[PDB]
Design a protein around this ligand. Structure first.
Ligand SMILES: Cn1cc(CCn2cnc(-c3cnn(C)c3)c2-c2ccc(C#N)cc2)cn1
Length: 104
């Protein structure tokens, strides 16, 4: 478990600092984005994961991964694949998948 929870910190810090992470650093502010409140049932972003991971609220490495994939599904649900946010999210999702397999 400790080996697992350590890899998540390596992964999230690399995601937090990735060039394409700029759409995921703080929660989407629905005041600024038409339709986001209606379309996305369960928001998630890197800061929410970082709080939860610090406070220690990830039982398993698979709970963490679930939160990561929820970020990118929300992104694909709300943003077109050729939008600025969309393009960035594909890079981040492919980065997460590629590096997550580098341990599991
Ligand atoms: C925090 N805020 C900023 C905005 C306006 C810009 N904007 C429009 N669309 C998105 C968006 C939609 N989906 N995703 C994953 C991001 C954003 C945006 C840009 C950067 C961040 C950060 N960090 C968060 C959101 C709205 N909220």
């Amino acid at each position: 478990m400790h080996s697992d929870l350590t890899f998540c910190e390596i992964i999230l810090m690399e995601m937090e600092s990735h060039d394409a992470a700029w759409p995921f650093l703080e929660p989407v502010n629905p005041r600024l984005v038409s339709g986001y409140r209606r379309i996305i049932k369960n928001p998630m972003d890197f800061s929410t994961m970082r709080e939860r991971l610090l406070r220690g609220g990830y039982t398993s490495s698979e709970e963490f991964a679930a939160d990561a994939l929820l970020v990118f599904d929300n992104c694909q649900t709300f943003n077109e694949d050729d939008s600025e946010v969309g393009k960035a999210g594909h890079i981040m999702r492919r980065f997460f998948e590629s590096r997550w397999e580098e341990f599991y």
